Amino acid sequence: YFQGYNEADVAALVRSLDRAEDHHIFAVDVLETYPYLAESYTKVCPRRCDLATAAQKALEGAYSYDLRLEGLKADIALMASNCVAYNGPTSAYAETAAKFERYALEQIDAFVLEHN
Numbered sequence: 001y002f003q004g005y006n007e008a009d010v011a012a013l014v015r016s017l018d019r020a021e022d023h024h025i026f027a028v029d030v031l032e033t034y035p036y037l038a039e040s041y042t043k044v045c046p047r048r049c050d051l052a053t054a055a056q057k058a059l060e061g062a063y064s065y066d067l068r069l070e071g072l073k074a075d076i077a078l079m080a081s082n083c084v085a086y087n088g089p090t091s092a093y094a095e096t097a098a099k100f101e102r103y104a105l106e107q108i109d110a111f112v113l114e115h116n
C-alpha cells in the first residue's frame with residue numbers, strides 16, 4: 001500500500017538533473033529551440049521528452065506512484081536515446097547523453113534509497 005513520493009520532491013529531483021556540464025541540452029524541448037527540425041527530428045525520434053516537461057509531469061503525480069521511479073527513468077532513457085540516435089553514436093553530445101543518463105539514474109536510485 002505504497003503512499004507515493006511527494007510531487008514537489010520528485011520535481012526538485014528532476015530539476016537537479018539539468019547540468020551546466022551537459023550544456024543544458026536536456027532542459028527544453030528540442031522542437032521549441034529548433035522549430036525547423038520538426039519533420040527531420042520526428043522521423044528519427046517519434047517520441048520526445050525533456051527536463052522541463054518531466055518537471056511539469058512530476059508536479060502532476062506522473063512518477064509518484066512508481067516504487068523505484070520506473071516512469072521517470074524511462075523518460076530519462078528516452079532523452080538520452082534520442083540524442084544518441086539523432087546526433088550519432090560517435091558524436092560528442094552522444095557521450096554527453098550517456099554521462100547524463102548515468103548521472104540521472106544514480107540520482108534517482110539515491111532518491112529512492114533516501115525516501116524509503
Ligand SMILES: CC[C@@H]1C(=O)N(C)c2cnc(Nc3ccc(C(=O)NC4CCN(C)CC4)cc3OC)nc2N1C1CCCC1
Nearest residue numbers: 023024025026027028029030033037041082083086087093
Ligand atoms: C538535435 C539538437 C541537439 C540535441 O540532441 N538536443 C537534445 C538539444 C537540445 N537543446 C540544445 N540546445 C540548448 C537548449 C536550451 C538551452 C538552455 O535553455 N539553456 C539555459 C539558458 C538560460 N540560462 C540561464 C540557463 C541555461 C541551451 C542549449 O544549448 C546551449 N541543443 C541540442 N542539440 C545540440 C545541437 C548540437 C549538438 C547538440
